[PDB]
Design an enzyme around this catalytic site. Structure first.
Site, PDB file in Angstrom:
ATOM      1  N   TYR A  51       0.796  -1.223   0.000  1.00 45.09           N
ATOM      2  CA  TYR A  51       0.000   0.000   0.000  1.00 45.09           C
ATOM      3  C   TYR A  51       0.821   1.263   0.000  1.00 45.09           C
ATOM      4  O   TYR A  51       1.811   1.377   0.734  1.00 45.09           O
ATOM      5  CB  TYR A  51      -0.903   0.079   1.221  1.00 45.09           C
ATOM      6  CG  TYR A  51      -1.981   1.127   1.080  1.00 45.09           C
ATOM      7  CD1 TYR A  51      -3.270   0.757   0.732  1.00 45.09           C
ATOM      8  CD2 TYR A  51      -1.720   2.482   1.300  1.00 45.09           C
ATOM      9  CE1 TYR A  51      -4.285   1.692   0.608  1.00 45.09           C
ATOM     10  CE2 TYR A  51      -2.734   3.436   1.174  1.00 45.09           C
ATOM     11  CZ  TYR A  51      -4.023   3.021   0.827  1.00 45.09           C
ATOM     12  OH  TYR A  51      -5.069   3.912   0.703  1.00 45.09           O
ATOM     13  N   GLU A 104      -5.193   6.733   5.914  1.00 42.28           N
ATOM     14  CA  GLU A 104      -5.285   5.508   5.138  1.00 42.28           C
ATOM     15  C   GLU A 104      -4.302   4.456   5.575  1.00 42.28           C
ATOM     16  O   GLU A 104      -4.556   3.262   5.437  1.00 42.28           O
ATOM     17  CB  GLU A 104      -5.116   5.784   3.637  1.00 42.28           C
ATOM     18  CG  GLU A 104      -3.859   6.538   3.246  1.00 42.28           C
ATOM     19  CD  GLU A 104      -3.890   7.017   1.789  1.00 42.28           C
ATOM     20  OE1 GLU A 104      -3.345   8.096   1.507  1.00 42.28           O
ATOM     21  OE2 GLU A 104      -4.447   6.323   0.917  1.00 42.28           O
ATOM     22  N   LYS A 127      -2.437  -1.596 -13.543  1.00 40.20           N
ATOM     23  CA  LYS A 127      -2.834  -1.200 -12.205  1.00 40.20           C
ATOM     24  C   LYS A 127      -4.310  -1.487 -11.987  1.00 40.20           C
ATOM     25  O   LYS A 127      -5.124  -1.278 -12.888  1.00 40.20           O
ATOM     26  CB  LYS A 127      -2.535   0.293 -12.003  1.00 40.20           C
ATOM     27  CG  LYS A 127      -2.428   0.744 -10.554  1.00 40.20           C
ATOM     28  CD  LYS A 127      -3.755   1.238 -10.015  1.00 40.20           C
ATOM     29  CE  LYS A 127      -3.648   1.590  -8.532  1.00 40.20           C
ATOM     30  NZ  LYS A 127      -3.413   0.397  -7.666  1.00 40.20           N
TER      31      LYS A 127
HETATM   32  N1  LIG Z   1      -3.578   9.676  -0.787  1.00 37.95           N
HETATM   33  C1  LIG Z   1      -3.560   9.409  -2.093  1.00 37.95           C
HETATM   34  N2  LIG Z   1      -3.555  10.391  -2.955  1.00 37.95           N
HETATM   35  N3  LIG Z   1      -3.562   8.172  -2.570  1.00 37.95           N
HETATM   36  C2  LIG Z   1      -4.674   7.279  -2.485  1.00 37.95           C
HETATM   37  C3  LIG Z   1      -4.472   6.034  -3.257  1.00 37.95           C
HETATM   38  C4  LIG Z   1      -3.836   5.001  -2.371  1.00 37.95           C
HETATM   39  C5  LIG Z   1      -3.608   3.624  -3.045  1.00 37.95           C
HETATM   40  N4  LIG Z   1      -4.531   2.605  -2.438  1.00 37.95           N
HETATM   41  C6  LIG Z   1      -5.871   2.019  -3.320  1.00 37.95           C
HETATM   42  C7  LIG Z   1      -5.523   1.277  -4.098  1.00 37.95           C
HETATM   43  O1  LIG Z   1      -5.823   1.417  -5.424  1.00 37.95           O
HETATM   44  O2  LIG Z   1      -4.987   0.030  -3.891  1.00 37.95           O
HETATM   45  P1  LIG Z   1      -3.968  -1.001  -4.522  1.00 37.95           P
HETATM   46  O3  LIG Z   1      -2.620  -0.515  -5.072  1.00 37.95           O
HETATM   47  O4  LIG Z   1      -4.802  -1.992  -5.368  1.00 37.95           O
HETATM   48  O5  LIG Z   1      -4.282  -1.784  -3.387  1.00 37.95           O
HETATM   49  C8  LIG Z   1      -3.399  -1.697  -2.195  1.00 37.95           C
HETATM   50  C9  LIG Z   1      -2.588  -2.581  -1.403  1.00 37.95           C
HETATM   51  O6  LIG Z   1      -3.598  -3.327  -0.690  1.00 37.95           O
HETATM   52  C10 LIG Z   1      -3.432  -4.747  -0.741  1.00 37.95           C
HETATM   53  N5  LIG Z   1      -4.451  -5.364  -1.507  1.00 37.95           N
HETATM   54  C11 LIG Z   1      -5.101  -4.907  -2.697  1.00 37.95           C
HETATM   55  N6  LIG Z   1      -6.027  -5.699  -3.188  1.00 37.95           N
HETATM   56  C12 LIG Z   1      -6.041  -6.784  -2.320  1.00 37.95           C
HETATM   57  C13 LIG Z   1      -6.863  -8.044  -2.291  1.00 37.95           C
HETATM   58  N7  LIG Z   1      -7.723  -8.332  -3.127  1.00 37.95           N
HETATM   59  N8  LIG Z   1      -6.533  -8.904  -1.187  1.00 37.95           N
HETATM   60  C14 LIG Z   1      -5.554  -8.653  -0.158  1.00 37.95           C
HETATM   61  N9  LIG Z   1      -4.810  -7.508  -0.172  1.00 37.95           N
HETATM   62  C15 LIG Z   1      -5.075  -6.590  -1.255  1.00 37.95           C
HETATM   63  C16 LIG Z   1      -2.163  -4.928  -1.481  1.00 37.95           C
HETATM   64  O7  LIG Z   1      -1.137  -5.363  -0.533  1.00 37.95           O
HETATM   65  C17 LIG Z   1      -1.669  -3.630  -2.098  1.00 37.95           C
HETATM   66  O8  LIG Z   1      -0.319  -3.444  -2.122  1.00 37.95           O
HETATM   67  C18 LIG Z   1      -2.146   3.199  -2.832  1.00 37.95           C
HETATM   68  O9  LIG Z   1      -1.232   3.924  -3.275  1.00 37.95           O
HETATM   69  O10 LIG Z   1      -1.931   2.130  -2.216  1.00 37.95           O
HETATM   70 MG   LIG Z   2      -3.855  -3.288  -6.778  1.00 40.54          MG
HETATM   71 MG   LIG Z   3      -0.836  -0.029  -5.274  1.00 40.97          MG
END
Ligand SMILES: N=C(N)NCCC[C@H](NCC(=O)OP(=O)(O)OC[C@H]1O[C@@H](n2cnc3c(N)ncnc32)[C@H](O)[C@@H]1O)C(=O)O
Ligand SMILES: [Mg+2]
Ligand SMILES: [Mg+2]
Length: 496
Positions: free
Chosen positions: A337, A371, A432
């Site tokens: 994350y 977050e 992504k």
């Molecule tokens: N403040 C800002 N401007 N930024 C906001 C954006 C933040 C952004 N987070 C949203 C985002 O798109 O997630 P994304 O990069 O998909 O999801 C985040 C993290 O959550 C965990 N994760 C995602 N999907 C799953 C799943 N299905 N099962 C278990 N773990 C999972 C993963 O470890 C991953 O590295 C991120 O950078 O992580």
């Molecule tokens: Mg992802």
């Molecule tokens: Mg990510």
């Protein structure tokens, strides 16, 4: 796995004259040697942890007591600047030893995931790590200073403090900005804030070679620092390059790797995740949570994060549920994350100019969202840490020139190339996909609304009214999530 921080959070006070947290754990009221004039504090922590390491005392300067929630990763470094010998028994004592040398400037040196409060004489110090990943709030009044890692504990009755935002709804309750330290005089009730870190605004140039290598080395070390010697860590992954990067490094640092993936009855990413567990040979487990149950946990996500931002909530809802449905003993969880924030990976931009504009203010507007708060997981007894937001990894990623983020037709390029020799090609180049997208959180949360009346040119604002409502009830109200029926709050908002 075992070995968690000495403390997850706390509630402390310093006066001249029973807390309830979302964080699950044991409570230990620290002693008060000079009683009335000492720093009182209730610590919340794992039942299998000895609070000791999270508390340190001294007579250097004055009677001094220090309480620290969380942990530090650059210990060897910090230890190298001190008069080697009486090595501290923990991070809290480590902090104290540093404060005796650099005073409040010590926090400019710390690379960690922590929140601390210290009292020395009638002086009170409040600090957070460079990113503020462990929310820290405060009520400052001449003669009274209450500190807490959860605003919900301070939501009852301070004076206005400059260089600090007020907590929504609450009055007299502020949050200590990220990478900052508040110098508070208990006598007068005056507070001065010093920032100990701020995103870099300049960019550096580097040939692909060196760039890909530096990014790998940094990430490996950020993870190495976060994995405990002996036990196998747990990595929550998607079968994204981000969490796969991390899984790869953790696997090497621990020699073994437990992984877990979340999914809903609308969509999931189990196939992308499996492709990674098979390459690395990790102990996998797939968790599927019904969309209805997913939405039913809205108040729990807002209660733990103490955030009122609709979009962030949609990012945390899936993750939060996953932590709660996690089976087995309390774990030390690593994540991927945040990786997108310094890369603008959530914007899908091919134009360098727009990419820099976007990644930039993103770095200037993350504070207050919470977050990355540990509560999202500690509410279930699990400790989480995020290596991509390690100060060293964040600095580097942020500094890279846009042409290294968006390159060769791929986004987050530099990171993709940094893990190309430890992950399958399909993974490294996988487009992504947000956690809230690959699970249908955002779409699902829009039916329950649309299915209650709210139409189009509203939906977003409506979600914002629902989230703000859940906050007032749980965080600013004393109401446990289990007492707030999501569908009820949705109804009262499906209007206007
Ligand atoms: N403040 C800002 N401007 N930024 C906001 C954006 C933040 C952004 N987070 C949203 C985002 O798109 O997630 P994304 O990069 O998909 O999801 C985040 C993290 O959550 C965990 N994760 C995602 N999907 C799953 C799943 N299905 N099962 C278990 N773990 C999972 C993963 O470890 C991953 O590295 C991120 O950078 O992580
Ligand atoms: Mg992802
Ligand atoms: Mg990510």
């Amino acid at each position: 796995a075992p070995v968690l921080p000495a403390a997850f959070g706390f509630l402390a006070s310093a006066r001249t004259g029973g807390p309830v947290f979302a964080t699950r754990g044991s409570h230990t009221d620290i002693d008060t040697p000079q009683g009335e004039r000492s720093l009182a504090a209730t610590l919340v922590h794992a039942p299998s942890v000895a609070p000791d390491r999270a508390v340190a005392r001294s007579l250097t300067g004055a009677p001094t007591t220090a309480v620290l929630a969380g942990e530090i990763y650059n210990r060897d470094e910090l230890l190298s600047v001190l008069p080697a010998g009486p090595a501290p028994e923990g991070d809290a004592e480590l902090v104290l030893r540093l404060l005796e040398r650099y005073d409040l400037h010590a926090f400019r040196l710390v690379n960690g995931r922590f929140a601390t409060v210290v009292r020395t004489g009638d002086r009170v110090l409040l600090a957070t790590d460079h990113a503020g990943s462990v929310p820290l709030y405060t009520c400052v009044a001449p003669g009274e200073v209450r500190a807490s890692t959860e605003a919900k504990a301070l939501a009852a009755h301070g004076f206005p403090l400059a260089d600090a935002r007020r907590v929504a709804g609450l009055t007299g309750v502020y949050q200590v900005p990220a990478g900052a330290v508040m110098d508070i005089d208990l006598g007068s009730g005056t507070a001065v804030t010093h920032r100990t870190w701020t995103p870099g605004l300049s960019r550096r140039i580097l040939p692909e070679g060196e760039a890909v290598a530096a990014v790998r080395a940094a990430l490996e070390k950020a993870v190495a620092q976060r994995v405990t010697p002996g036990d196998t860590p747990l990595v929550v992954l998607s079968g994204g390059i981000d969490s796969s990067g991390v899984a790869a490094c953790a696997h090497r640092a621990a020699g073994e790797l437990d992984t877990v993936s979340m999914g809903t009855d609308t969509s999931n990413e189990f196939r992308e995740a499996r492709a990674v567990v098979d390459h690395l040979r990790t102990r996998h487990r797939e968790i599927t949570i019904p969309t209805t149950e997913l939405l039913a946990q809205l108040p729990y996500a807002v209660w733990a994060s103490e955030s009122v931002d609709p979009d962030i909530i949609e990012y945390l809802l899936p993750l939060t549920a996953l932590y709660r449905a996690l089976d087995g003993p309390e774990r030390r969880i690593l994540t991927g994350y945040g990786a997108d924030i310094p890369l603008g990976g959530m914007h899908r931009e091919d134009r360098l100019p727009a990419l820099d504009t976007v990644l930039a203010h993103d770095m200037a507007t993350f504070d207050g969202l919470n977050e990355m708060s540990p509560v999202l997981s500690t509410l279930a007894g699990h400790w989480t840490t995020h290596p991509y937001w390690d100060r060293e990894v964040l600095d580097l990623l942020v500094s890279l020139e846009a042409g290294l983020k968006r390159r060769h037709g791929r986004d987050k390029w530099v990171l993709r190339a940094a893990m190309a020799d430890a992950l399958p090609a399909e993974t490294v180049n996988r487009p992504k996909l947000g956690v809230h997208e690959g699970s249908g959180t955002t779409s699902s949360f829009s039916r329950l609304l649309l299915d209650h009346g709210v139409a189009e040119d509203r939906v977003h604002e409506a979600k914002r009214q629902v989230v703000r409502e859940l906050f007032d009830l749980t965080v600013g109200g004393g109401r446990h999530p289990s007492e707030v029926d999501t569908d009820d709050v949705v109804r009262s908002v499906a209007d206007r």
